[PDB]
Amino acid sequence: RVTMNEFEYLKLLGKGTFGKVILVKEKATGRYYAMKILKKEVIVAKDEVAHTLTENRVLQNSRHPFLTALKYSFQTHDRLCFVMEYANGGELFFHLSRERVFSEDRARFYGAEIVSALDYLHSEKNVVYRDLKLENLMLDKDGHIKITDFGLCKEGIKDGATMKTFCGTPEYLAPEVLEDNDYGRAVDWWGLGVVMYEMMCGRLPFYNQDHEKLFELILMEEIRFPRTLGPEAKSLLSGLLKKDPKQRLGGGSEDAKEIMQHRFFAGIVWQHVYEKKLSPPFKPQVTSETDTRYFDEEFTAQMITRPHFPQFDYSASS
Template structure:
């Protein structure tokens, strides 16, 4: 059928090239943009890269304006050479796959396009400018319990959605949690997500952020989506008390605390808050809150008795804090360490110093299938 026909075309770049040329010919002479939009792709020169807004192990994130309509995006640009040297291509492809699946959830960042040049990968994402949760938490040290509850409920909803797709997030931490301009949670950075993990499946990969690692991950034991509920408990604890629950400057001591130290009760939290913290930070993953019925267990806990989940997921509950954002391109909630850096000219050029159009034909073996453009009228052409 049609599906098999398309698969055969995509697997033969030369044939695909001729078909695209034919479509461009039809578009030029007949003027049918819908034919071209199916094959269209973005390229670096479609954007004006304005500011650096973040840095990571493999590249940088830029605020960029799309030239043809003036819309703002966050464009994550990764260096292929660094990814390949560290053998991290699987994580990058996992991030791309997860981003493609999560466009329907209100608390997950959306992917608009992905494309590649000979030496770089590009993710074109929603620009979320309310700042990292970590930025606001550092400034205020702790959050009042109602504010923490609101954020944790939105995070739990996002994690529950990922779990419903058999995806474990694995790296929940304040740096990966953004606020949008209205004050809602947006989860980003899906490089450590593990696909294909249902509630009955397990994995053993050692990864994540040390302060939030679950005991079973530290022990290199098989684990499942309950590691995300441990991380959720760690973030809630940090929001309420200013530090992760088993934190120590000495990493080995912190690991030992995570594995063996009981959760110490601290004043200032309600009984229901302590109840959910004890449930989420249960060292035995098989007894952890969420181990039996995943997100349904979390949402049914008395800590969330005041939350109407339907209203929450439709963004009908007013956020407890509205970030100070003056416009769609306001970058005041980003670290000046990033925003004061010069945008490199090489962002739109290859190592051979020629402007490129990053289409599916330029995929190499390590990143086959990375490029994505929605088959819609939202075309760059």
């Protein structure tokens, strides 16, 4: 079990309303980690307490190749710290920004890994993620997907159990969430649809700057694809982006299993996906370990610096 001092603070990785994320070296071990440092004041003040707890709990009982692991989690008078595996590869949002579009093969690979991760969360942990977006998908040193940021998860969601909470990111919301209907775990598939759409198409499948106009598109406009998109890719995206959740690929009792069987994924051996036996299509090219290429210069070129939370503190079992 640890405190603020057991770490050296090497580089800034992001700054936002709720805090910052520092690349860190752990003194006792030499292992580099990513520290999310939240300002307790802000969390309580911005009402983000319940979400923060949810993230602690979700990370604590999930261990998966493609979900960000959590090593330690602790506190101070003014701070909540999450100490986590470093995604050297930065956000998928970073790479798309610069390449425009990914090949189908490369999108297939990232999508298999997301499907593996969302399946584990649904079937093994009874969790619905709810916030699938490019920003939330990172790459590790090898170029495997890492889903980060679990504060919007819903827990104890078994089979067709349904939720009411209006949350996510506007551009990514499922039609059933927009209808203000009850909704089930199929919302994650709508999301997988969107990120996979962006990966292969280079744009979002629905977009206006005005939320209400964006929401109409999501509810009313049927999808359209670039004319170069192959039929299996096109069928997958159509199935994932059905507005009716009961028609969505992944929407039945089969869940993930329905997507795993789709012709788009014909080549894939799901057990090799999980075991990282597949050729990642992109290894992040870092000279060293505090190389922060794939993180914004706005952040990486900077110099670094109220109640108690019951049972917040946690260390990763050996």
